[PDB]
Amino acid sequence: NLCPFGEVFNATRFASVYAWNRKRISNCVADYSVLYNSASFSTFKCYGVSPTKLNDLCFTNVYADSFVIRGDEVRQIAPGQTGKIADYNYKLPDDFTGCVIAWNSNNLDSKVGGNYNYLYRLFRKSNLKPFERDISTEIYQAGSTPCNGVEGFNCYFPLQSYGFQPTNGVGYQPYRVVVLSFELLHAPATVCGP
Amino acid sequence: DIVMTQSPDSLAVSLGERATINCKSSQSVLYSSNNKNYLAWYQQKPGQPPKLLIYWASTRESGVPDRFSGSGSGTDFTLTISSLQAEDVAVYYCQQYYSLPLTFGGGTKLEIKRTVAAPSVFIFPPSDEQLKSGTASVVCLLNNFYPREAKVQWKVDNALQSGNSQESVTEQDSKDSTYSLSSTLTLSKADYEKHKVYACEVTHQGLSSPVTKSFNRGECS
Amino acid sequence: QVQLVQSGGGLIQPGGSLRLSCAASGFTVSLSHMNWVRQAPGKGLEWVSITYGDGNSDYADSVKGRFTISRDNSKNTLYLQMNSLRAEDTAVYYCAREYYYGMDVWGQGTTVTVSSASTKGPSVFPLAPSSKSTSGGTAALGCLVKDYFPEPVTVSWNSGALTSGVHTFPAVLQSSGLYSLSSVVTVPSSSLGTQTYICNVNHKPSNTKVDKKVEPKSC
Ligand SMILES: *[C@@H]1O[C@H](CO)[C@@H](O)[C@H](O)[C@H]1NC(C)=O
C-alpha cells in the first residue's frame, strides 16, 4: 500500500498559493527515499526530522500541501517567516514538523505573453493563522472610505497575479512547492516507512 | 482638493552635508484608524519618470540608500538626506494619496553648493546674415557663475528694455557646479537700425559692482 | 518584474486627437489601479486620471469630458484617448500604477506636443567672437539656432573634437510658436587666429544638418 505521493508531486495542474491544495495521506507505507535522493529539487529543508532518516519514522497522518509561487518567495515557506506569502497566503506554524520541497517549473507554468492564471493575496485585514486557507475575494478597504463591495479609490481587489514569462529572471520564475506535514497524535500510526 | 506646498523651491547643499526638504498639506493626511500618513516622496532626474523614495511618510522603498529618510505627521512632513551625494542632485516631489484628486507638491530642486563665482560676460551683435531676414537677435552670455541668481538688464540707447527678451539657463555643471545663462533681445530689423548703443548690464553676488558689455551698431566690436 | 512600456503620442494640431497606450507585465492591469500623470515642459506633476480594476475611471477636472480610458485585458494594456486637444495639454504623459502606498512603477513617458506650427528646419547664425578679447584672456563664440519646430536640436563643435567649455542652452518657445536656442563655447583668445570653429547643427525632424564656420568679423 504505497502512499500516492506521485499524485501530488507529479500533478499536471498546481493550485494558486492563496487557494493551496491539501491532500491527507493515511494508512499507507511511504518511501521518502525516492524524494530526498532525487536531484530534481532545488529546495528540500525539513523541520523536526532529519530528511535522510525519514523511512525509519512513523506518523499518524501526513499532509501534502502544494501550490505555485515565484522563486524569491520560496524562502517565505518556513516557520517564523514574514512577507505577503507567509502572512497572507500560506503560513507555517512555529512548531512545524515536516519538509518543504520546491523545484523550478518554468517550462510547465510560464507562457509566452505571460501566465496570469496564478494568483496570490496582496491585501488582508489580518495575518493568516498557521495552515489557514483564505479564498475570499472581498474588495479591500485600504483608505479612509468604505468600499461597499465595489472598486474605488484605495478600494482594491485583494488578489494579484505573477504573469510568468519564460524569459523571466530565475528569481521571478515559477516554482512548484510541496509541504509535507508529519502529524503525531495520541493514536495508532498509519503512515510508516518500509 | 488637498493642496501640497513644498519649500524651499531650490536648495543648495555642500557635498557630504545634510539636506532637508519640507512639504505641507492643506489638510491632514493622517488616517486615524490605522495611524498611517498617506504621503509619499519621489525623486525625479531629467528625462526619467519619478521614482518612489518614501511612503507612509517614513517607510523607505526597497533599494533606497540609508541616507534618505522621511519624517513628519499630519500636515507637515520632511525629507532628509543625511550625507549629500552627487547622485542625489535631482528634483523631489511630495504627493498625498489620501483623497482624490491626487496632488503633488510644486517640487524642490536640489543642487550642490559651491563658492561664489562671478560670471564672465559677453555680448554678441546680430549677424549680417540674420538682418537680411528682417529680424535682429542680440545675445548676452553669462558664463560659469554661482549662485544661479543674476540680473540681466538690456539697454538700447541707454533706455532700459523690458518685455522683449528671453532667458535660458543651463543645469548645474557636473564638473565645477556652475551655471551659465543666455538672454536674447529680439528686435525687428527696422527697430535695430534706429538705435546705436546696445548694452547688457549684469548684476551678481560675485561682482562688487555691475558689469556692462556693449557695442555700437556699425562699429567693430 | 512589474514593468510599464508606453507607446503613441507625438505632434498634433489643436482640436485633434491622440491615443496613448501603456502595456504592463508582471501584474494584471484589470486587477490593479492605474494612473495617467502629465508634466508640462519645465513644470511639475499633474495627475490626469485613475482607472480601477473594473474599467471605470475618475478624472481631474482639467481633462474631464475630453479624455477617456479604455483597456485591453488580453493585451494587458491601458489606453488614454485624448480628444479636443489644446496647447496647454502639451506635456510628457506617464502611466503609473496606483499601488496602495503610492505610484511604485512608472512608464518611460510619452511626449505630446499640441501645436499648429509646421515642421521646419532652423536658421543658423554665428555668434562671432569679439575683436576686443583680452590678450591672454578668454573669448566666447557660438551659434544661434533660430526658428525651428519641433524639438529637439543638437549642436556639436568641430564634429565632436571640441567639448570642453561648450554650453548648449535649453530651447525657448517663442511667441511665433517656433523654438530657438544658442550653443556657446569659451576658448583662449590666442586660438582665434589659428583654430577653426564650426558648429554642427542637427534637426532630424526636418532632416536638417548645418555646418556654420564661426570666425572674427571684419571691420
Ligand atoms: C514522478 O514521475 C517520475 C516518473 O519516473 C518520477 O520522478 C517519480 O516516479 C514520480 N514522483 C513521485 C513522487 O512519485
Side-chain angles (χ1 to χ4, degrees), chain A residues 5-7 9-10 34-35 38 40:
Chain A
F5 285 124
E7 282 179 31
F9 283 87
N10 284 339
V34 311
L35 316 182
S38 161
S40 322

Side-chain angles (χ1 to χ4, degrees), chain A residues 9-12 14-44 46-83 85-128 130-157:
Chain A
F9 283 87
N10 284 339
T12 299
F14 262 51
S16 287
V17 58
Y18 86 95
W20 48 276
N21 271 346
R22 157 161 294 195
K23 191 191 176 73
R24 191 180 192 253
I25 288 171
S26 298
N27 308 302
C28 61
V29 199
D31 183 8
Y32 307 103
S33 72
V34 311
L35 316 182
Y36 189 69
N37 283 319
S38 161
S40 322
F41 300 124
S42 64
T43 284
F44 205 128
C46 296
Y47 302 83
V49 294
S50 161
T52 166
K53 324 251 172 123
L54 269 179
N55 278 9
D56 312 316
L57 294 179
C58 277
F59 299 101
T60 321
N61 306 289
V62 173
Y63 300 80
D65 305 328
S66 54
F67 48 84
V68 160
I69 48 174
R70 79 180 203 188
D72 59 9
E73 286 168 345
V74 174
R75 46 182 171 253
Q76 292 189 37
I77 313 303
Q81 284 301 330
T82 49
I85 301 305
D87 300 321
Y88 296 164
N89 289 269
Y90 186 86
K91 182 56 180 174
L92 288 179
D94 293 347
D95 64 353
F96 172 68
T97 301
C99 302
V100 179
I101 310 165
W103 67 98
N104 187 290
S105 62
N106 197 40
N107 274 344
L108 296 171
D109 295 322
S110 273
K111 295 184 196 294
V112 176
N115 182 6
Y116 294 89
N117 290 326
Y118 284 110
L119 302 176
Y120 64 93
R121 182 170 310 280
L122 182 54
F123 301 110
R124 204 168 186 272
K125 276 152 82 172
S126 70
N127 288 347
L128 290 178
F131 295 129
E132 188 180 5
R133 182 182 185 261
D134 189 349
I135 61 173
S136 66
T137 60
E138 281 266 320
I139 303 307
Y140 175 84
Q141 181 189 331
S144 321
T145 304
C147 307
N148 306 290
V150 84
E151 285 197 54
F153 179 60
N154 279 338
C155 281
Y156 292 91
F157 194 73

Side-chain angles (χ1 to χ4, degrees), chain B residues 57-74:
Chain B
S58 75
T59 304
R60 253 155 50 194
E61 182 78 314
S62 53
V64 179
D66 308 336
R67 57 182 183 272
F68 290 94
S69 61
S71 35
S73 185

Side-chain angles (χ1 to χ4, degrees), chain C residues 88-125:
Chain C
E88 302 80 39
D89 299 315
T90 295
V92 172
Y93 284 75
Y94 300 94
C95 65
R97 170 167 73 173
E98 244 311 290
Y99 217 59
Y100 70 108
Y101 53 61
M103 309 189 196
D104 66 312
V105 54
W106 294 64
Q108 85 273 12
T110 286
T111 293
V112 171
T113 303
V114 187
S115 171
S116 53
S118 312
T119 299
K120 175 188 184 301
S123 291
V124 179
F125 304 115

